Ligand binder design. Sequence first.
Ligand SMILES: CN(C)c1cc(CN2CCOCC2)nc2nc(NCc3ccc(C(C)(C)C)cc3)nn12
Lengths: 339, 313
Amino acid sequence: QEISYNCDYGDNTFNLAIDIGGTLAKVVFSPIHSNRLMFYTIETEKIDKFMELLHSIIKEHNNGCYRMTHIIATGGGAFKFYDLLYENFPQIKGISRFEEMEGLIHGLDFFIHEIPDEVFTYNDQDGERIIPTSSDSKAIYPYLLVNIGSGVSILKVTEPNNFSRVGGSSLGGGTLWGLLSLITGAQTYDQMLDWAQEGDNSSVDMLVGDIYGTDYNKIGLKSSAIASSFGKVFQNKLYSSHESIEKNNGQMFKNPDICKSLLFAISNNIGQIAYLQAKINNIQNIYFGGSYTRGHLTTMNTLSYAINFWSQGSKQAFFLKHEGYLGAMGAFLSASRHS
Amino acid sequence: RITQEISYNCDYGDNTFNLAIDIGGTLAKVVFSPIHSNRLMFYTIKFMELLHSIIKEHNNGCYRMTHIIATGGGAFKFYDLLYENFPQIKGISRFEEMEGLIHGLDFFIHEIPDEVFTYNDQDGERIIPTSSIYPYLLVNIGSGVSILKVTEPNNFSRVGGSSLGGGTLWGLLSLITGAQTYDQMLDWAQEGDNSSVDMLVGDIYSAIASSFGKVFQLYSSHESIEGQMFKNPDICKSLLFAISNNIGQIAYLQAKINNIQNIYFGGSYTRGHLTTMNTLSYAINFWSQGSKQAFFLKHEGYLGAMGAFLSAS
Ligand SMILES: CN(C)c1cc(CN2CCOCC2)nc2nc(NCc3ccc(C(C)(C)C)cc3)nn12
């Protein structure tokens, strides 16, 4: 989903930035004199596949010129994969590392300030609205980045170059993916999202309605609000697997319903934690980064609604067209300055 | 057979057998006192059938001298069912759930010795002599989580909550592992090693980076997608940590927003399990750098029924 941008190509080094996380590798590069920023994601699980993509990019977009390629690695996996990269690319110009936080924030601020049609709000009522951020300091800052990958990172940015980590969560995309993979057999994240879309969570969640007979207006909750995620399930050997889960249980619980339930559980939790962090830090604007929302309308509506609800309208969820690429973009910009 | 009991000089001015019931999503709790016994009797659970036996055994089968106070959603969802089930009773009344919990908690704090305690694996159990306070948070964990702020006697509000509560833990672990009781889940959790299903920091580069994050790792023309197995004990530990750490974090953030140091954990979640208590205590101790404190309660599951009981008189 390439972007037009006038890059400074410097000494013509080909800068190949990689953000390596728990689960995914996200790559940003610009062929020399193209003025195009290009973006790819691949799972890290099959090393050959990952390394092979990097090889193909060098061959297809830098004419096989290893000796003028600089790989800059960011994300948590920059450390773990450093030796794999070195052994794969003996003949390249260099390999460097960029701190994860600076990566995310440099990448995000770049997207906010420079790239049109990149930042957007979304909910089921309003549809998508592009926020024209790449048109000052006091309008943009302060903000929070909620970067959802395997876990959840939360960073606050008070002004240019002024940013820090605040507490994150271990209940992130990896949790949602792990649980639904094992429970439902779903083969890909995209499949889980399609099943979630069709599902009815109320068959496995207890709603306020199920516990009361009605709204619980004294505490601000409608009957349709979720009171206990997966709360309906209990009432109704060393190892478990999808197989055993299916043999034991059949279709008492339906896959679409499980997917929607847990999509709501994890996204609402993330939205709440984000809210609470924004509340403590007196921040109105909350960006979502990572590869969790993937422009999925249900997911974005869920997150937007959680921030809106918990804040009673005083805070706002923002999404990014290149959400997954913030870290790699920041690394890219560092290597660019260098060359 | 009642095995949980407190001596207390109850007020029997009305010459009524007060029977308080907390009808929550998943569990039902009773608090009652045989007239003039000075014994408070507690029971957690075919339920309506229990209430009958209680009247039979502890009030001589006398319906016309029994008063029921109902708290929780059942009280409203099923107000009629109580009248259908308990005709000819002296009276049925209701008590609002949040107010139930706080009156019950304040009673345990102020009146009952050896009720409030800290627990962690480092220093063990410490009884806090509260009965010898404000403001405080109550984090009441049942099917879901209710979080209440209490500034002073009779000043409180529900500030927050979470749908990721005991029912989520029990639900996930039932379906995934086939475990049949909360007890088996906790026993398995205590043996388990979460690192086989969780991505830890070390995995990305013993803190958890992603709970359960290691698990994900046209027409038919090749082999069946068919698969990988994970150990039940490790799954129970992963999800116990995930749900407990999250609750601890939300509790800490709420406490921070509300400028509260003292955080009480209520409901039927910890059940006196050292591992669960340790995890909650650790989470609060960690985030606050020691400036906030987790408290537990010997009668954690009966806060709401206790408050309802006291409302009768
Ligand atoms: C997910 N939403 C939208 C929210 C929002 C809030 C706080 N809001 C702040 C803004 O003003 C309105 C209130 N609290 C929430 N708690 C839950 N579930 C836990 C839960 C809900 C209900 C119950 C009973 C019925 C048994 C008492 C027990 C546990 N969800 N939830």
